[PDB]
Amino acid sequence: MIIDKLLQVSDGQAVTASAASTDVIDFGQANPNTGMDDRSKMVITVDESADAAGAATVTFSVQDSADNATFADVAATGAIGKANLAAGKQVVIPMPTKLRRYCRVYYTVATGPLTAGKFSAQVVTGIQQNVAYPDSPRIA
Amino acid sequence: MIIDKLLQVSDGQAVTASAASTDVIDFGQANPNTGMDDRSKMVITVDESADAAGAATVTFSVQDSADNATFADVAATGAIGKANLAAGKQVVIPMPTKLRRYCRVYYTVATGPLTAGKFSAQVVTGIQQNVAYPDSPRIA
Amino acid sequence: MIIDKLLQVSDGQAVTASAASTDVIDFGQANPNTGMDDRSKMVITVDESADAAGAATVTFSVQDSADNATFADVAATGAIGKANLAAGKQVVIPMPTKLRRYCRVYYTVATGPLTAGKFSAQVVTGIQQNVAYPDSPRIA
Amino acid sequence: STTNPTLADVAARMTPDGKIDPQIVEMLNETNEILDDMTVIEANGFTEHKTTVRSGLPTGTWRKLNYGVQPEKSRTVQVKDSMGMLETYAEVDKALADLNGNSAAWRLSEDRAFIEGMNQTQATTLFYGDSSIDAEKFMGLTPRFNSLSAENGQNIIDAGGTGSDNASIWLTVWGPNTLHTIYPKGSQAGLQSRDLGEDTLIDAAGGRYQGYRTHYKWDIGLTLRDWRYVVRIANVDVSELTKNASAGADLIDLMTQAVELIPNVGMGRPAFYMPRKIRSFLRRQITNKVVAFDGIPCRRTDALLLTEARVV
Amino acid sequence: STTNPTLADVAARMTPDGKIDPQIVEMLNETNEILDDMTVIEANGFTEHKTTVRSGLPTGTWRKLNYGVQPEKSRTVQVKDSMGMLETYAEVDKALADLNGNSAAWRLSEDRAFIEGMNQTQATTLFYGDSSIDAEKFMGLTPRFNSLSAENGQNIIDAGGTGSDNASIWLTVWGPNTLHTIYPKGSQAGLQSRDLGEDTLIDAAGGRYQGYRTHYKWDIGLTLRDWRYVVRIANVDVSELTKNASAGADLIDLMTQAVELIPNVGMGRPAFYMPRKIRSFLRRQITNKVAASTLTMEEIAGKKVVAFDGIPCRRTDALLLTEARVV
Amino acid sequence: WDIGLTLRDWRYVVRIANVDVSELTKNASAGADLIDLMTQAVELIPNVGMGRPAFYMPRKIRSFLRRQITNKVAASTLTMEEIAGKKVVAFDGIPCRRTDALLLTEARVV
C-alpha cells in the first residue's frame, strides 16, 4: 500500500482517551474536495490491538477546518468495537466528498478509555483490500 | 445524474422525526461491498428545506444488516445544520467499502423535530458535483 | 414432469371443506373427448399433508358440464385416506373418455374438515412413475 | 365515457393527407435556439465527466546574483458533472400507419414532431434543471449561478428583482474547454430516433394487434467547465421594463457589464439567451439611443422562463 | 421495502478505469462432471420414456406321472418416467448495457455465469430430483433409492453413519438400457443459449423500458431402466473419515462392494461420482493401504484416483456433503 | 523494487498452518504427519491447470518431510542404497522450493 509521507497522519499513535490525530494535513487550497478524486481514501490501520478495560468502541472520523483552528466532522464510521481492532485491520473512510484546508483524524473513543492501541491514518490511492469470497459453498 | 429505479430509496420522504428511510436496498449477496467499486456513492438530496423549530441538524448515515431487520451504521456525515439544507443541496456519502446484504439510509435528526423537508436517497455513478472555485481573486 | 400451465387447475388450492377447484377448464368444443387423445390424464399432487382432526378421506374427481355452470362426475378415485397424502402423492385420474366442454376438479372430503393440505391438479402427458421392482427376491 | 388514446387514431392519421402528406407547418411550438448553438463532447468518466480545474498557481521569483530560489507546486481540484437520459417511444396501430402506403412518411412526420417536443423539454431543462428536484434529469445553469454568496457570484449581476415577475438573461461561451454538453460513452450525441420493428401491441382487453414503434433516446448532460465564461443577469423585473430606457431596469448597460465581465471571448463562441419579451424590450431600448448585440450574437429563447423566483 | 432484481446499475460493479472486466475470476463455478459423462438419447413416448421390465417368471413344475400340468404366463410390468424443462431468460435494460459500449462485452460476461449456473442446477438436480415435491423437475437419484425397504433398497449400501454430516457416493452405469438422460421431440440436449436480441420490456407501471434478453433452454429427463445398475453408498459420515482407514467409514471396501453389487459391468460404462471431499480422503486412504505394502519413494503422493476399479471415478461437486442420514 | 501481490482467487493457494516444529518426529508419529498434510493440500486445489504450483517450506520442514518420506516407504520398499532417500524435489510432482525467508516460529493461527 503506497503512501505519501505528507498525507501520513498519526503514525503509530497510542489513542487512549478520546483524542485527535497527531498530525494535520494541510492541502494548499481552501477546498481540496479530494473526495472527487474518487480515489483518495482515509485508512486507519491497527496495531497492536484495542485493549481497554472494555467494552469500548473507537469511532474514527475525519475533520475539516477553514483554518487550522477548529475541526468539524465531514466523515465518520460508527462505533467500531474493540475486538475488531486486532493487529491488522484497515478501517477505511472514503474521502469526504467536500474537504476544506487542514484535515485531521479524530478518534472518538466511547468509554472507557483504551489501555493500549496504535493507529495509522493516511490518505492513499487506493487501499489494499482483498476479502475472502465464497466457494460453492456446498463443497465444502 | 443518472438513476437506477431500484437504487432509489426514500423517494421524497418527509422526514420529521429522526427516522430511518422508507426503502431498504437489498443487494443480492452476503457482501455486495460496493465501496470497492470506487464509483457507487449514496446521495441525499434536500427539498424544500429543513425547516424546524431549530437549531436542528440531520445526520445522514448509511446502515448495513445481515438480514432485513437489524441495522448498524457503516458510514455517516456529521451534524449538517439547518439552512445548509435548502432545496438543492446534495449531501454525498461515498459508499462504504464493506457493505452487507440490505443497506438503508437513516436520518438522525437532532432536536427539535423537522417541520418540513423531504430527502431523496439513491446510489449513483456518479454525483453531479460542481462547486464554483475562485478566479484570481485579484481581478476582481 | 412437464406441465401445461393452461391445463393446470387448482394451482395449490387449500382443500378444507368439500369444495371445487378454483379454475374450470374450458375446451374449444362441445365434445373435446380428450380422454380419447389416449394420452391425457388428471394428476392431483399433495402438499403438505392430509392433516385433519380425522379420520378423513379426500375423493378427487373430474366433473364435466355443457356450459360453465352445473357439473357432474365423470371419474372418481374413492375415499383416499388421510395419511396417504404425504407430501408428494400423485393421484392419477385417467382423463375420462367422454369429455364435454368445461371440466373441473371437486374434492369430496369425508368428515371432519381437512385442516391443512393443498392439492395441484393438472392434465398431463404423462406422469413420472418409475417405482423399483423386485429382482430375486432371494438375493434380494 | 370519453375516448382518450395515446396512439395515432384514424382522425390524426387522416390529417397529414392529402392526397399530399409532408411539410407540416408548426405554428404552436417554442423556437428556442441553444440547441443549435451548443457544442457536444463525449463524456470522459462513467456517466460523469471529470474536469481538473487549476486551484492555486506557482508564483515566480526574481533571483539575484548567486542565490538559489525555492520550488513551487501547482494545486488542483477536479470537478465531475453528470448526464441524464430522455427517452420516449412513438407507437401506431400497424394497419393504420401502413395504409395508403405511407408508412415511412408517417413515421417521419411523427419523427419531426417528436424531435420538436424533445427540443423543448431538453432546452427548458438545460436552464433550469436541478438534479436536486427532477432527480433523474441533469443539472444546468441553475442553481449553478444561484446564490450571490457563491464563489462565481461576481458572475451573476442582479438587475434588481424583488417581485417574482422577473426574467434573467444568460451569456455563455460554448466550447470544447469552457461549457459544452456531454453525451455518454458511447451512445451517440444528440437525439436518436431509432425505429424498431413491427411487434405485437396489446388492446386493453388483450385483442392484440400489430404495430410500429420508435424509440427516442437523447441523453445529455452539461459540463460547465469554468463558470467564468458564463454570466447570469438575474432578476430582470419584467413588470418594470419600458422602451424608453428610463423607468424600470435598463438592459443595454446592464448587458454590456455582463460582456465586460468575461475573460476572454477567444473560443469558442459566445451567446446571449434571453426570453423573447426581454429581447423585445432590449431592442426597443437600443433604438431609443440610436442577430449580434456587441461582438456576440444574441439568441432569443422562448423555452426560458419569464417569471422565475428572484435570487439572494 | 427492499427493491430488486433484474440487473441493477452494477455493471459498474464489473468494470476498471474502462470497459467490462474480461479476466473475471470465476469463483462459484465447480467442476462436477456427470453432465459431460452422461448419455443422452431422445425419449421414446410423447414426453416420457416408457420401458417394459420383466415382472414375473414362469416357474415350471416337477410333474408326478401321467398328469397334464398348467401352462405358465410370464408377467411383465412396464414403467414410464418423465422429462422436465429447465430454462431461463437473461434481461438487461439496453440503456445499462450500452454505456462505454460494453453491450457485447457485458452480454458475454453475464453469459459465462449463465452456462455455469445451468450446469450447477442441472447436476444438483440430477441427484436430488424430487418430482414429488417440485412437480416441475424430472426425478433424479434420490429418492429413487431412499428407504432401505424399497425394492432397490439392497442396492443402496449403508456406510453406517448417523447425524446430518454425511454424504453418499454414487456408482452408476450410463448406457442405453441401464441409465441415461432423455431429451424431447424435437428439442435437442443440452443447454441452448439463443440470443433474443434487443426488444422492448415493460416498466412495472406499464411505463416502457428497453433491453436485451437471452434464453437458455435445457430440458432433460432421466431413464433409470433398472436400479440393479445403480448402487448408492449412503451415510458416509464425513467428519469421521480418517486417512488411516481407521475411525469411521472406510472408502475402499465400501467402494469395491459397490462394484460387486453391479450385475456384470458390461454396458455401457460405469462411473463413481463422489463429493470432492470424499475424493480427497479416498486418495489418502488408498496410499495408506498400499503404504504397508509396496509404494515407491517417488509415488509417495499417490496417483490421483482415475480408475478405481477400471471404472472412471468422477469428481462431482454439485452433490451435497451434508445430507440427512438415510434411515 | 516495487511489487505487491495479487491473490486472484484463494482457491489456488493452501496454507498448512500451526505445524508444531518441536513435536515433529521422523517416524511420522508424534505431532503432524507431513505426507498426508501435504497430499490433502494437493487435493485442495481445483485442478492445478495453470500456471504452475509450488510448495514453500522452511528448511526445517524440508528435512522432516524428507525423513518422514523415507520412513513411510520404509514400511514397504526402500532399498539399501536409497536408505537416506532422494532429496525432495517434486512432491506431487509439484516443485518443492526451499524458502529460508520463511519464519519458523510463527504464532498459532486459530
Numbering used by the authors:
A (entry chain L), B (entry chain M), C (entry chain I): 1 to 140
D (entry chain G): 5 to 294, 310 to 331
E (entry chain F): 5 to 331
F (entry chain A): 222 to 331
The article reads:
Arranged on a T = 7 icosahedral shell, MCP and CP each have seven copies or conformers in each asymmetric unit. MCP alone forms a complete icosahedral shell without any noticeable gaps. CP forms dimers bound to the underlying MCP shell at local and icosahedral twofold axes, making the maximum diameter of the BPP-1 (670 Å) bigger than that of the HK97 capsid (659 Å). CP contains two β-sheets each consisting of four anti-parallel strands, and a ∼36-Å long extension (Thr125 to Ala140) with the C-terminus exposed on the external surface. In BPP-1, CP subunits form a dimer through β-sheet augmentation between the F-strands of two CHEF sheets, forming an 8 stranded β-sheet visible on the external surface. Although little sequence identity (CLUSTALW score = 5) was detected between BPP-1 MCP and HK97 gp5 proteins with ClustalW, the overall architecture of the MCP resembles that of HK97 gp5, with an axial (A) domain, a peripheral (P) domain and an extended loop (E-loop). The orders of these three structural elements in BPP-1 and HK97 are N-β-α (‘BPP topology’), N-α-β (‘HK97 topology’), respectively. Moreover, the topology of the Johnson fold in BPP-1 MCP is non-circularly permuted as compared to the previously known topology of the Johnson fold. The P-domain and E-loop of MCP in neighboring capsomers join head to tail to form rings (bright colors), which concatenate to form non-covalent chainmail.
Bacteriophage BPP-1 is a short-tailed, dsDNA virus and a member of the Podoviridae family. It infects and kills Bordetella species that cause whooping cough in humans and respiratory diseases in other mammals. It has a T = 7l icosahedral capsid, ∼670 Å in diameter. In this study, we report the three-dimensional (3D) structure of the BPP-1 head at ∼3.5 Å resolution determined by single-particle cryoEM and derived an atomic model.
